[PDB]
Amino acid sequence: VTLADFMPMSLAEIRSQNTGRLSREEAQLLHRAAQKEKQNNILYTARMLTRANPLLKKEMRAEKFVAPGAVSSMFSPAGYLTELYREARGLHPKDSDRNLDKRRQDLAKLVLSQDNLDNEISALSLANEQLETALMAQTGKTDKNKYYETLATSRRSGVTPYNAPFEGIHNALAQRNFVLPDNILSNPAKFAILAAYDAGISPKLYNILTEDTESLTGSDLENSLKRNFPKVKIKDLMTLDALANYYELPAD
């Protein structure tokens, strides 16, 4: 109890707290006592656990041993993750935005199980879920397909005017080696839009690339910059790193 709390703390942690109470030498003596008591306690439990070894059962606390690879083990990845989260969750203060508990609200909620340790999931799908659960919480909508419908028209990045239905059409229809504007069954007066869908262009992106932005002066220029760039500062976008990252192409 007394020296048990001072075991995970460092010397600078012990000296950091109770500055008026503890001196500089007493903190060092207390640190040495706590570390040696931690060593002797773990030697004591290793001495009681090595008596249950099946090569010594003829010469004889055998409560519970688990298999290698079980989630209950002290050498499991669950135990490593518990050690790691316990040493990690106090590095930044709880006010800070760089704290582990604030930037990831799924780790304190996270359950340790044999299923979580064994089952394989797609890491990309987990990244997608991690972004969806933040974006839908920002917009307040709880539905998923309603959010992709309101994402179908939006222009607020260089990657945003896309339709997941249209990308599904384009991928499935190009996987048949099928070419839309080269049919016998088409309107020849609608070859342009059909070829734009053939190259693969969302209809909102077609409405972007359709605009007569050249020779456009007055307040309509301000309206067009407000529409085609809703969220960015244009003065922040002028640099080359912003134009590389905003449209997701390399700066070279």
Partner: protein, 879 residues
């Protein structure tokens, strides 16, 4: 891609930012393809590992620096960074036998190494393997013949520090060696076996006279020193003798320097008789006070002194008769030999840590680094630590260039002002240090330093030095906007701890012992004088367990007492299940020495054996016991004759009962020869001879496939008995004897196995399993029929060693916890609280559910590999 863009378009409010910034900020990699799959806990592990690496390299500002100066993060990169090297290090405490190696051991002596050199060839017949063992036994005889000549204790309190010894060999000429005895592992007067260094040969040529050799420590370097006599002849018909002091020392690579020379003889030492020298360090005016002195029944009628600088130049002291009068409890007599300690500071300093701290945001911590006095003044050396952390108000908090305070220049900011008895002297770091600790690292809790290099404070004027040199205060002052001062009181005073004598003796039948405060410690051993008759019969008689039961004489005058104690009572033992047990002389009130401490047991008598020495010059003795209830009464042990064994059986008028022994039997008096000790000073050599040499030869014959001789060498240690239990032929494996008190100060499975020798049992059993599976595979590859039945009987013998395959439970009391719930700080505090309670025997366990905490222990994966290996071999046999 689209969601990653729209995130910082909306959440981060910075669409300029990189996509890799979402992996730096959000700890989930985004540009991964759709085919890379992971488990969920491994993705959380990789995310928190990325978080630790980015906050340990400075890419995450605002981190707690004190949490990063921690043994988890100080050992991050070597051990804790990866799952593999976390598991492989954490298993090294619980399963050392997976990583033990009978070939490579830390602390392995030169004899074992030069035997392993000779067994490293391929053809290992009986002749090579016997000649190597006889050469090893020769070297073992030489290091066991060593009688300790003289010594030097490090510090002044002999409960602490170190003790170097100088041991000579039983040859002509003599080969002087040296050990080191670490008193920091010496509790209750009982050295742990790792508190001893090995012997190590002093390679220089040393030719003393009158057995005058003393080691001495000068700034943590062993110096050897002796007086060499040279027989000469005068120009006339007479013949003189020139005496010469010599002084060598170790170098860093273990070599020994060339000895120096100093002319001694001035008309008096040639006329002395039976004389001897004295050498010791000095904490004041650092030198080596060398002193050779005439002997009588009383010490030192005449003496002559000499100082040795770090320049190693002579400096003749004109008076040591005033000096040795303060030392003469360490100087020898005509019949005693006394190991010396360093000379004391004539004045010792003390510092009162507080009067008034002033402003409490900065702790204002000084630390008195060095402190001496010169011939006329008192010098000091100081460093100064402020806090200098966050929430200095108001804020920006943008940038610092190293209405508000002075964020800029910290010139002349801190200043020490010692007060003398009437005057004062204010120095300042603007007058000292051009090195200027900047407030940037502005990130919180970063503390600073202010070193004062060798502040020589002049001058104590008109003070009685040192009678009433209690001088009033010593004060520093950090003067800045919002900074303060705190002051300290020197408590300096001359001291003299009088006559804490430490000495060497030899009993007339062979043994030696170092006799200090209330204890004796056997230095040498007489096993080498009695192996000589056993070893003529061969290796089979050397490694027999009757050789390990060989006696050894008792050190000096003293008695053995073996005490049987009652099982635990809540009433008469207090609440503590542990105990400690003392003895004294005893003119009552003269203090009593702790000779043993231990944890008494429930439902079982505990038998504790002792050796109570006779130091005090009806030679009485008395014994006590201390419980949580109270302390016990004394029990007399006298003798009427000079017979050594007799110490009257349950002696006079006092009843002879502590209230905790609960027997009519106390005695244990007789058998002067105790058995040989494998926890004493000579422990490593005995453990090598009786365990590590058969282990090395057995693992060396398992390699290169000499199985029928490897099984013989494994049968020197373990041999199966008619009962179900095995018969252990190495004594401390039959009597499980810890010989390493502090194993976790280094990364080695050997020390952990030395703390609990059951891992040596499991190492031996795993080597025998390796042997049996290797013999079975050699018989299996000879694919004929009778040799296949041979293979089956070998694998069935290996399964007989292993036994019943342990069924791994899966239906368990393991709930599926939250990671927040699994990593609570209370969950480790309560764990170590309960184990630290039960280890001291604070009371009984509640009865006995959670001995491991949250995470259950697992089986050894190597042994389970043996199970699956034998099952596959025998399945292929049966088909």
């Amino acid at each position: 891609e689209a969601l990653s863009g729209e995130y910082r378009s909306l959440v981060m409010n910075n669409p300029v930012a990189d996509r890799d910034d979402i992996w730096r900020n959000l700890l989930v990699d985004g540009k991964v393809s759709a085919e890379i799959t992971t488990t969920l806990l491994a993705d959380a592990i990789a995310g928190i590992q990325l978080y630790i690496n980015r906050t340990i390299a400075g890419d995450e500002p605002g981190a707690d620096s004190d949490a990063l100066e921690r043994q988890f993060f100080k050992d991050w990169d070597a051990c804790n960074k990866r799952y593999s090297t976390w598991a492989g290090v954490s298993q090294l405490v619980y399963y050392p036998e997976n990583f033990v190696d009978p070939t490579l051991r830390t602390g392995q002596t030169g004899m074992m190494n030069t035997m392993l050199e000779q067994l490293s060839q391929s053809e290992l017949n009986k002749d090579t393997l016997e000649n190597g063992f006889r050469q090893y036994l020769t070297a073992f005889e030489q290091v066991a013949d060593l009688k300790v000549v003289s010594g030097y204790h490090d510090t002044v309190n002999i409960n602490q520090g170190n003790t170097w010894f100088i041991g000579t060999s039983q040859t002509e000429p003599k080969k002087y060696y040296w050990r080191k005895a670490d008193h920091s592992k010496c509790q209750n007067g009982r050295f742990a076996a790792n508190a001893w260094s090995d012997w190590k040969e002093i390679t220089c040529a040393v030719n003393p006279y009158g057995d005058m050799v003393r080691p001495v420590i000068f700034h943590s370097r062993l110096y050897l020193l002796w007086i060499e006599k040279q027989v000469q002849k005068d120009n006339t018909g007479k013949d003189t003798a020139s005496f010469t002091l010599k002084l060598t020392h170790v170098k860093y690579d273990g070599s020994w320097a060339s000895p120096f020379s100093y002319d001694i003889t001035e008309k008096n030492i040639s006329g002395w008789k039976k004389t001897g020298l004295y050498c010791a360090a000095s904490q004041e005016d650092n030198s080596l006070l060398i002193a050779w002195y005439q002997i009588e029944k009383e010490t030192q009628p005449n003496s002559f002194g000499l100082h040795i600088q770090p320049d190693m130049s002579c400096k003749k002291e004109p008076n040591i008769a005033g000096i040795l009068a303060t030392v003469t409890h360490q100087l020898d007599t005509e019949t005693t030999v006394r190991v010396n300690t360093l000379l004391n500071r004539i004045s010792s300093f003390e510092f009162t840590l507080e009067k008034q701290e002033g402003n409490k945001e900065i702790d204002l911590v000084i630390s008195h680094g060095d402190y001496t006095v010169k011939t006329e003044n008192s010098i000091s050396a100081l460093i100064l630590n402020p806090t200098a952390y966050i929430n200095i108000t108001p804020y920006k908090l943008f940038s610092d260039i190293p209405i508000a305070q002075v964020k800029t220049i910290s010139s002349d900011d801190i200043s020490m002002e010692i007060e003398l008895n009437s005057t004062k002297f204010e120095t300042i770091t603007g007058s000292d240090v051009g090195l200027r600790p900047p407030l940037y690292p502005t990130v919180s809790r970063e503390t600073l330093a202010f070193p004062f290099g060798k502040l020589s404070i002049t001058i104590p004027a008109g003070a009685d030095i040192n009678n009433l040199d209690c001088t009033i205060k010593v004060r520093f002052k950090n003067t800045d906007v919002l900074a303060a001062t705190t002051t300290y009181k020197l408590v300096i005073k001359k001291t003299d701890p009088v006559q804490k004598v430490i000495s060497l003796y030899t009993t007339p039948d062979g043994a030696q012992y170092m006799e200090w405060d209330g204890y004796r410690t056997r230095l040498n051993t007489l096993f080498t004088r009695q192996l000589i008759e056993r070893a003529n019969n061969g290796i089979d008689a050397i490694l027999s367990p009757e050789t390990q039961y060989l006696p050894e004489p008792k050190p000096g005058q003293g008695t053995y007492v073996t005490l049987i104690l009652k099982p635990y009572d809540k009433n008469t033992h207090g609440t503590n299940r542990a105990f400690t047990i003392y003895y004294s002389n005893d003119a009552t009130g003269s203090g009593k020495f702790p000779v043993y401490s231990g944890s008494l047991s429930v439902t079982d008598n505990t038998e504790v054996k002792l050796f109570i020495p006779l130091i005090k010059p009806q030679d009485t003795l008395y014994l006590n016991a201390t419980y949580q209830k109270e302390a016990t009464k004394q029990i007399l042990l006298f003798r009427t004759d000079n017979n050594p064994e007799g110490w009257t059986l349950d002696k006079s008028v006092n009843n002879g009962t502590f209230a905790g022994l609960a027997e009519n039997g106390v005695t244990g008096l007789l058998q002067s020869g105790e058995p040989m000790d494998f926890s004493g000073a000579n422990a490593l050599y005995f453990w090598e001879l009786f365990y590590y040499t058969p282990m090395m030869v057995a693992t060396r014959l398992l390699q290169e496939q000499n199985f029928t001789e490897a099984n013989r060498w494994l049968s020197y240690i373990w041999q199966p008995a008619a009962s179900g239990a095995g018969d252990w032929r190495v004594r401390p494996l039959k009597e499980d004897t810890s010989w390493n008190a502090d194993p976790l100060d280094s990364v080695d499975p050997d020390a952990v196995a030395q703390n609990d020798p059951m891992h040596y049992k499991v190492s031996t059993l795993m080597k025998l399993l390796d042997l049996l599976i290797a013999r079975g595979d050699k018989a299996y590859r000879m694919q004929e029929r009778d040799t296949l039945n041979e293979a089956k009987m070998w694998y069935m013998q290996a399964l007989g060693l292993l036994g019943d395959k342990p069924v791994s439970i899966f239906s368990n009391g393991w709930e599926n916890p939250s990671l927040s719930n699994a990593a609570d700080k209370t969950q480790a505090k309560q764990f170590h609280d309960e184990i630290s309670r039960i280890r001291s025997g604070g009371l009984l366990p509640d009865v006995a559910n959670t001995l491991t905490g949250l995470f259950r222990p697992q089986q050894n994966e190597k042994l389970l590999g043996y199970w699956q290996m034998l099952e596959m071999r025998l399945f292929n046999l049966r088909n």
